[PDB]
Amino acid sequence: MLEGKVKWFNSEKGFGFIEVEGQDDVFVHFSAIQGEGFKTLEEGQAVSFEIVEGNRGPQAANVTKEA
Numbered sequence: 153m154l155e156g157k158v159k160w161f162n163s164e165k166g167f168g169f170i171e172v173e174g175q176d177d178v179f180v181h182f183s184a185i186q187g188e189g190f191k192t193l194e195e196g197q198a199v200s201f202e203i204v205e206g207n208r209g210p211q212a213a214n215v216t217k218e219a
């Protein structure tokens with residue numbers, strides 16, 4: 153369990169990327185980092201997730217907005 157910080161989001165284009173110190177840019181989509189009700193985000197949004205290792209490299213999967 154760690155925290156990530158948006159590098160930039162492209163929710164409209166169907167995806168957004170997070171960037172975290174000690175790791176690379178976590179791939180993000182408004183479906184995993186989402187939550188109760190349809191949400192959206194701006195730059196500077198810090199989220200919490202668990203990066204794993206898959207074919208395209210390390211990536212978050214069940215991320216969530218940091219409260």
